[PDB]
Structure formats: structure tokens, C-alpha cells
mmCIF file of C-alpha atoms and ligand atoms in Angstrom:
data_model
loop_
_atom_site.group_PDB
_atom_site.id
_atom_site.type_symbol
_atom_site.label_atom_id
_atom_site.label_comp_id
_atom_site.label_asym_id
_atom_site.label_seq_id
_atom_site.Cartn_x
_atom_site.Cartn_y
_atom_site.Cartn_z
ATOM 1 C CA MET A 50 0.180 0.101 0.180
ATOM 2 C CA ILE A 51 0.791 3.447 -0.606
ATOM 3 C CA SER A 52 0.789 6.437 2.367
ATOM 4 C CA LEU A 53 1.697 9.775 2.581
ATOM 5 C CA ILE A 54 3.268 11.140 4.795
ATOM 6 C CA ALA A 55 3.262 15.251 5.328
ATOM 7 C CA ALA A 56 3.323 18.267 7.492
ATOM 8 C CA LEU A 57 0.771 21.155 6.851
ATOM 9 C CA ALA A 58 0.822 24.813 8.687
ATOM 10 C CA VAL A 59 -2.418 27.079 7.877
ATOM 11 C CA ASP A 60 -4.292 26.658 4.599
ATOM 12 C CA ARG A 61 -2.769 24.092 3.160
ATOM 13 C CA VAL A 62 1.098 25.133 3.522
ATOM 14 C CA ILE A 63 4.260 22.617 3.366
ATOM 15 C CA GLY A 64 6.690 24.831 2.227
ATOM 16 C CA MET A 65 8.680 28.310 1.110
ATOM 17 C CA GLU A 66 11.626 28.498 -1.408
ATOM 18 C CA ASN A 67 12.205 25.145 -0.923
ATOM 19 C CA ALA A 68 12.054 25.232 3.261
ATOM 20 C CA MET A 69 10.011 24.425 5.914
ATOM 21 C CA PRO A 70 10.341 27.072 7.897
ATOM 22 C CA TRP A 71 9.565 25.871 11.307
ATOM 23 C CA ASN A 72 11.016 23.890 13.691
ATOM 24 C CA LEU A 73 9.881 21.004 15.078
ATOM 25 C CA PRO A 74 12.441 18.010 16.446
ATOM 26 C CA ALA A 75 8.835 16.658 17.711
ATOM 27 C CA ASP A 76 7.703 16.306 14.656
ATOM 28 C CA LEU A 77 11.047 14.811 12.847
ATOM 29 C CA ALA A 78 11.481 11.945 15.719
ATOM 30 C CA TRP A 79 7.716 11.417 13.977
ATOM 31 C CA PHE A 80 8.199 11.514 10.520
ATOM 32 C CA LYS A 81 11.605 8.984 11.558
ATOM 33 C CA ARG A 82 9.725 6.162 13.316
ATOM 34 C CA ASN A 83 6.574 6.482 10.643
ATOM 35 C CA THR A 84 8.897 5.834 7.646
ATOM 36 C CA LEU A 85 12.420 4.129 9.387
ATOM 37 C CA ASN A 86 13.132 0.729 7.229
ATOM 38 C CA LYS A 87 10.226 1.962 4.480
ATOM 39 C CA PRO A 88 11.324 2.741 0.954
ATOM 40 C CA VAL A 89 10.912 6.763 0.342
ATOM 41 C CA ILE A 90 10.161 8.341 -2.712
ATOM 42 C CA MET A 91 10.245 12.093 -2.706
ATOM 43 C CA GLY A 92 10.144 14.702 -6.315
ATOM 44 C CA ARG A 93 13.541 16.309 -7.260
ATOM 45 C CA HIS A 94 12.914 19.892 -5.394
ATOM 46 C CA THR A 95 12.439 17.960 -2.336
ATOM 47 C CA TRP A 96 15.790 15.656 -1.944
ATOM 48 C CA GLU A 97 17.775 19.000 -2.467
ATOM 49 C CA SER A 98 15.909 20.589 -0.149
ATOM 50 C CA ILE A 99 16.441 17.655 2.574
ATOM 51 C CA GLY A 100 20.302 17.545 1.222
ATOM 52 C CA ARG A 101 20.948 14.112 2.025
ATOM 53 C CA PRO A 102 20.303 10.686 1.782
ATOM 54 C CA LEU A 103 17.966 9.332 4.801
ATOM 55 C CA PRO A 104 19.534 6.951 6.361
ATOM 56 C CA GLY A 105 17.849 3.637 6.372
ATOM 57 C CA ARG A 106 15.102 4.389 4.153
ATOM 58 C CA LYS A 107 14.898 2.660 0.306
ATOM 59 C CA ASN A 108 15.503 5.790 -1.539
ATOM 60 C CA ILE A 109 13.969 6.877 -4.653
ATOM 61 C CA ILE A 110 14.204 10.211 -6.564
ATOM 62 C CA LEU A 111 11.404 11.235 -9.045
ATOM 63 C CA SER A 112 12.992 13.187 -12.490
ATOM 64 C CA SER A 113 12.699 14.049 -16.181
ATOM 65 C CA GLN A 114 16.214 13.950 -16.013
ATOM 66 C CA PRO A 115 19.178 11.264 -15.867
ATOM 67 C CA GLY A 116 20.058 11.550 -11.760
ATOM 68 C CA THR A 117 22.905 13.127 -9.786
ATOM 69 C CA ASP A 118 24.001 10.920 -6.669
ATOM 70 C CA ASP A 119 24.680 6.711 -7.306
ATOM 71 C CA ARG A 120 23.384 7.036 -3.195
ATOM 72 C CA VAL A 121 20.244 7.418 -4.654
ATOM 73 C CA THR A 122 17.576 5.546 -6.587
ATOM 74 C CA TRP A 123 16.154 7.126 -9.651
ATOM 75 C CA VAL A 124 13.477 6.548 -11.684
ATOM 76 C CA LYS A 125 11.769 9.119 -14.605
ATOM 77 C CA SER A 126 7.726 8.188 -14.140
ATOM 78 C CA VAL A 127 5.199 7.333 -10.688
ATOM 79 C CA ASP A 128 4.622 3.241 -12.368
ATOM 80 C CA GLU A 129 8.194 2.879 -11.983
ATOM 81 C CA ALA A 130 9.169 4.399 -8.853
ATOM 82 C CA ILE A 131 6.475 2.112 -7.694
ATOM 83 C CA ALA A 132 7.868 -0.449 -9.455
ATOM 84 C CA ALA A 133 11.441 0.149 -7.932
ATOM 85 C CA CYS A 134 9.428 -0.359 -4.339
ATOM 86 C CA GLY A 135 9.947 -3.722 -4.881
ATOM 87 C CA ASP A 136 7.172 -6.372 -2.867
ATOM 88 C CA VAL A 137 6.865 -4.278 0.908
ATOM 89 C CA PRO A 138 3.699 -3.781 2.769
ATOM 90 C CA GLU A 139 3.780 -0.053 3.044
ATOM 91 C CA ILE A 140 5.536 3.227 0.831
ATOM 92 C CA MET A 141 5.646 5.992 2.273
ATOM 93 C CA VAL A 142 5.834 9.169 -0.069
ATOM 94 C CA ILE A 143 7.153 12.230 1.565
ATOM 95 C CA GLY A 144 6.520 15.411 -1.270
ATOM 96 C CA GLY A 145 6.873 17.863 -2.174
ATOM 97 C CA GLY A 146 3.338 18.876 -3.556
ATOM 98 C CA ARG A 147 3.855 18.521 -6.792
ATOM 99 C CA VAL A 148 3.995 14.508 -5.920
ATOM 100 C CA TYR A 149 1.907 14.340 -3.551
ATOM 101 C CA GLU A 150 -1.462 15.420 -6.215
ATOM 102 C CA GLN A 151 0.017 12.925 -7.981
ATOM 103 C CA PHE A 152 0.114 10.084 -5.464
ATOM 104 C CA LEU A 153 -3.064 11.226 -3.554
ATOM 105 C CA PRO A 154 -5.119 9.159 -5.906
ATOM 106 C CA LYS A 155 -2.805 5.992 -5.022
ATOM 107 C CA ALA A 156 -2.990 6.572 -1.574
ATOM 108 C CA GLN A 157 -4.567 4.218 0.989
ATOM 109 C CA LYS A 158 -3.312 6.207 4.356
ATOM 110 C CA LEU A 159 -2.539 9.290 5.491
ATOM 111 C CA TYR A 160 0.125 10.614 7.924
ATOM 112 C CA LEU A 161 -0.378 14.056 8.553
ATOM 113 C CA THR A 162 0.975 17.091 11.231
ATOM 114 C CA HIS A 163 -1.100 19.404 11.435
ATOM 115 C CA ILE A 164 0.862 22.546 12.841
ATOM 116 C CA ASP A 165 -0.157 25.486 14.641
ATOM 117 C CA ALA A 166 1.392 28.063 12.400
ATOM 118 C CA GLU A 167 0.139 30.762 10.100
ATOM 119 C CA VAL A 168 3.788 31.317 6.955
ATOM 120 C CA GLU A 169 3.801 32.336 4.268
ATOM 121 C CA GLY A 170 3.897 29.316 1.478
ATOM 122 C CA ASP A 171 4.453 27.956 -2.492
ATOM 123 C CA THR A 172 4.052 25.506 -1.465
ATOM 124 C CA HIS A 173 0.344 23.675 -0.224
ATOM 125 C CA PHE A 174 -0.505 20.615 0.146
ATOM 126 C CA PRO A 175 -3.286 19.223 -2.886
ATOM 127 C CA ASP A 176 -7.112 19.296 -1.534
ATOM 128 C CA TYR A 177 -8.630 15.910 -0.703
ATOM 129 C CA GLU A 178 -11.704 15.187 -0.578
ATOM 130 C CA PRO A 179 -12.342 14.562 3.996
ATOM 131 C CA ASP A 180 -15.533 12.789 2.618
ATOM 132 C CA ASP A 181 -13.018 9.589 2.057
ATOM 133 C CA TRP A 182 -10.582 9.613 5.094
ATOM 134 C CA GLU A 183 -11.234 8.462 7.975
ATOM 135 C CA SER A 184 -9.773 9.227 11.602
ATOM 136 C CA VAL A 185 -7.808 6.240 12.867
ATOM 137 C CA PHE A 186 -5.561 8.249 15.121
ATOM 138 C CA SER A 187 -5.820 12.119 16.403
ATOM 139 C CA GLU A 188 -2.833 13.315 18.379
ATOM 140 C CA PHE A 189 -2.212 16.588 19.725
ATOM 141 C CA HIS A 190 0.215 18.960 22.424
ATOM 142 C CA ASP A 191 0.518 22.132 23.011
ATOM 143 C CA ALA A 192 3.978 23.726 22.428
ATOM 144 C CA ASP A 193 7.073 23.383 24.952
ATOM 145 C CA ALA A 194 10.804 24.177 25.160
ATOM 146 C CA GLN A 195 11.350 22.718 21.695
ATOM 147 C CA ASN A 196 8.498 22.625 19.797
ATOM 148 C CA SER A 197 7.143 25.950 19.823
ATOM 149 C CA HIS A 198 3.848 25.504 17.463
ATOM 150 C CA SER A 199 1.422 23.034 19.233
ATOM 151 C CA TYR A 200 0.414 20.235 16.723
ATOM 152 C CA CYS A 201 -1.984 17.378 15.932
ATOM 153 C CA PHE A 202 -0.330 14.739 14.376
ATOM 154 C CA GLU A 203 -3.434 12.253 13.026
ATOM 155 C CA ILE A 204 -3.394 9.056 10.315
ATOM 156 C CA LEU A 205 -6.590 8.978 8.612
ATOM 157 C CA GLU A 206 -7.529 5.944 6.541
ATOM 158 C CA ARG A 207 -9.124 5.790 2.935
ATOM 159 C CA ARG A 208 -12.759 4.427 3.684
HETATM 160 N N1 NAP B 99 6.034 19.875 4.897
HETATM 161 C C1 NAP B 99 6.126 18.537 4.270
HETATM 162 O O1 NAP B 99 5.832 17.862 4.969
HETATM 163 C C2 NAP B 99 7.044 19.038 3.119
HETATM 164 C C3 NAP B 99 7.223 17.684 2.453
HETATM 165 C C4 NAP B 99 7.946 17.372 1.638
HETATM 166 C C5 NAP B 99 8.297 18.132 0.354
HETATM 167 N N2 NAP B 99 8.491 19.942 1.256
HETATM 168 C C6 NAP B 99 8.671 21.189 0.911
HETATM 169 O O2 NAP B 99 8.313 21.391 -0.998
HETATM 170 C C7 NAP B 99 8.665 22.330 -2.079
HETATM 171 C C8 NAP B 99 8.462 21.278 -2.724
HETATM 172 O O3 NAP B 99 7.825 20.474 -3.433
HETATM 173 P P1 NAP B 99 7.250 21.324 -5.131
HETATM 174 O O4 NAP B 99 6.108 20.494 -4.853
HETATM 175 O O5 NAP B 99 8.724 22.323 -5.049
HETATM 176 O O6 NAP B 99 8.786 19.855 -6.019
HETATM 177 P P2 NAP B 99 8.838 18.527 -5.980
HETATM 178 O O7 NAP B 99 8.038 17.107 -5.762
HETATM 179 O O8 NAP B 99 9.155 17.906 -3.568
HETATM 180 O O9 NAP B 99 9.637 17.733 -6.338
HETATM 181 C C9 NAP B 99 8.792 17.757 -7.946
HETATM 182 C C10 NAP B 99 10.039 17.463 -9.489
HETATM 183 O O10 NAP B 99 10.113 15.949 -9.358
HETATM 184 C C11 NAP B 99 9.777 15.708 -10.385
HETATM 185 N N3 NAP B 99 8.797 14.853 -10.766
HETATM 186 C C12 NAP B 99 7.772 14.969 -10.314
HETATM 187 N N4 NAP B 99 6.581 13.868 -10.126
HETATM 188 C C13 NAP B 99 7.554 13.227 -11.587
HETATM 189 C C14 NAP B 99 7.070 12.232 -12.524
HETATM 190 N N5 NAP B 99 5.517 11.919 -12.556
HETATM 191 N N6 NAP B 99 7.700 11.659 -13.779
HETATM 192 C C15 NAP B 99 9.379 12.552 -13.140
HETATM 193 N N7 NAP B 99 9.305 14.042 -12.570
HETATM 194 C C16 NAP B 99 8.944 13.987 -11.845
HETATM 195 C C17 NAP B 99 10.496 16.287 -11.455
HETATM 196 O O11 NAP B 99 11.453 16.730 -11.011
HETATM 197 P P3 NAP B 99 12.535 16.858 -12.438
HETATM 198 O O12 NAP B 99 12.256 18.998 -12.514
HETATM 199 O O13 NAP B 99 13.790 16.830 -12.667
HETATM 200 O O14 NAP B 99 11.795 16.683 -13.638
HETATM 201 C C18 NAP B 99 9.646 18.041 -10.700
HETATM 202 O O15 NAP B 99 9.680 19.278 -10.696
HETATM 203 C C19 NAP B 99 9.909 22.644 -1.014
HETATM 204 O O16 NAP B 99 8.811 23.417 -0.468
HETATM 205 C C20 NAP B 99 9.676 21.440 0.346
HETATM 206 O O17 NAP B 99 10.444 22.096 1.853
HETATM 207 C C21 NAP B 99 7.236 19.595 2.378
HETATM 208 N N1 FOL B 100 5.566 14.677 9.018
HETATM 209 C C1 FOL B 100 7.073 15.701 8.461
HETATM 210 N N2 FOL B 100 7.206 16.464 8.238
HETATM 211 C C2 FOL B 100 8.184 16.008 7.770
HETATM 212 O O1 FOL B 100 8.955 17.751 8.397
HETATM 213 C C3 FOL B 100 7.929 16.245 6.872
HETATM 214 N N3 FOL B 100 9.193 17.186 5.563
HETATM 215 C C4 FOL B 100 9.760 15.734 4.365
HETATM 216 C C5 FOL B 100 10.918 16.225 4.064
HETATM 217 N N4 FOL B 100 11.549 17.106 4.520
HETATM 218 C C6 FOL B 100 12.501 16.593 5.456
HETATM 219 C C7 FOL B 100 13.409 16.859 5.581
HETATM 220 C C8 FOL B 100 14.556 16.731 7.038
HETATM 221 C C9 FOL B 100 14.182 15.507 7.455
HETATM 222 C C10 FOL B 100 14.635 14.660 8.545
HETATM 223 O O2 FOL B 100 16.943 15.608 8.414
HETATM 224 N N5 FOL B 100 14.853 13.676 8.613
HETATM 225 C C11 FOL B 100 15.549 12.307 9.794
HETATM 226 C C12 FOL B 100 16.362 12.965 11.310
HETATM 227 C C13 FOL B 100 15.766 13.428 11.755
HETATM 228 C C14 FOL B 100 15.518 14.316 12.924
HETATM 229 O O3 FOL B 100 17.274 14.873 12.631
HETATM 230 O O4 FOL B 100 15.423 14.165 14.155
HETATM 231 C C15 FOL B 100 15.361 11.467 9.924
HETATM 232 O O5 FOL B 100 15.925 9.945 9.424
HETATM 233 O O6 FOL B 100 13.839 10.874 8.695
HETATM 234 C C16 FOL B 100 13.052 14.860 7.100
HETATM 235 C C17 FOL B 100 12.470 15.156 6.123
HETATM 236 C C18 FOL B 100 8.912 14.624 4.680
HETATM 237 N N6 FOL B 100 7.475 14.835 4.974
HETATM 238 C C19 FOL B 100 7.627 15.431 6.226
HETATM 239 N N7 FOL B 100 6.299 14.737 7.549
HETATM 240 MN MN1 MN B 101 2.350 29.179 16.519
HETATM 241 MN MN1 MN B 102 -9.590 15.266 11.607
#
């Protein structure tokens, strides 16, 4: 199955100028625990934002052009990306906006972080029809000495 995982600010903002302009250690820890030991699929801009491979995960980068780093696996279409993951239980799509929009129709779960932050952005999570998803997990946290905003982890499953 295919899952998307994302962090959303107000208005579905997910990025600005190829970065995420918040800093939430709790949410990066949640990202790691939900992705480790799985394939991750990302677009080339997100690969450039992360700036290095992610350890302990098969890294599969979508680009139309040939790859430039053999520490990761480069593919040129959605179907090739899926094929390159092999027979695993859960593929994790880790963005960015253009890649999320393509994989939404093929996905069974969304792991969302809802962050209580108002920021300007240039990238959004795709609009998703709410009726088609059920919430199966919703865990709220107030801001603390490490995490400057409140946030909510949510898992949704396609009904
Ligand atoms: N908040 C979050 O959870 C989160 C998560 C991920 C990313 N982000 C943010 O999202 C932004 C990046 O997103 P983005 O929408 O600009 O870009 P993106 O989706 O990461 O990358 C798009 C690129 O991927 C390639 N691509 C996409 N679909 C393809 C396909 N079907 N076949 C072949 N290649 C394909 C293309 O590369 P080529 O141009 O090389 O052909 C395309 O330009 C950044 O601001 C980043 O910080 C936020
Ligand atoms: N929930 C969620 N939060 C995010 O921040 C996020 N970011 C991306 C894309 N960007 C990034 C940027 C950095 C790292 C990162 O450094 N993660 C490391 C270390 C985590 C840490 O230092 O705590 C990792 O091992 O996963 C991952 C993805 C995709 N999905 C997400 N999903
Ligand atoms: Mn805030
Ligand atoms: Mn909900």
C-alpha cells in the first residue's frame, strides 16, 4: 500500500523557497519513526531540500532527467517509482507538492501533522476530499521548550 506523510501549516502550506519554515523536533521524530525501514519516494526539489540521503530507508527520487547521485535510486515516472520499491508492505511518499498530488489517488493512508502556525508559502498539500477519509488516530500536543507551536498528529485511512 501507498501512504503519504506530510506536515501542514495553516491553509495547507507545506513549504517556502524550497524549505520548511518551522522547526519542530517532535514532528521530525514522528517522521523518522513512521518512515524508517521503508522505501521513501520524493520529488527532485524535495531531494534538494533534504540535501542528503535519509538513513535506513530506500530513497527513490523522481526526476525527468538522469540522476546525479548513486547513493539513491532515480526514476522517471510514478509507475517506475512504485516498481522500484519492490514487494514491501508500505511505501511512503514524502513529497513535495507536485508528488503528493500525483500519489494522492493511489494512496490508502495519510499521516498528517497539523501545525498551528501561520506562514507564507509557495507549496501546498493537495486539496483532499474529506468524506473519503476516516480518522483513526489524532494526538494533540501543546507547544513546549523544544517545539514552538502546537501540533496534532493524525492518521487517516481511505474508507
Ligand atoms: N511540509 C512537508 O511535509 C514537506 C514535505 C516535502 C516537501 N516539502 C516542501 O515542498 C517543496 C517542494 O515541493 P515541489 O512541489 O516544489 O516539488 P517536488 O514535488 O518535491 O519535486 C518536483 C519535481 O519532481 C520531479 N517529478 C515529479 N513528478 C514526476 C513524474 N511523474 N515523473 C518524473 N519526475 C517527476 C520533477 O523533477 P525534474 O524537474 O528534475 O524533472 C519535478 O520538478 C519544498 O518547499 C519542500 O520544503 C514539505
Ligand atoms: N511529518 C512530516 N514532517 C516533515 O518535516 C516532513 N518533511 C519532509 C521533507 N523534508 C525533510 C527534511 C528533513 C528530514 C530529516 O532530517 N529527517 C531525518 C532526521 C530527523 C531528525 O533529525 O530528527 C530522519 O532521519 O528522518 C526529513 C524530511 C517530508 N515529510 C514530512 N513529514
Ligand atoms: Mn503557532
Ligand atoms: Mn480529522
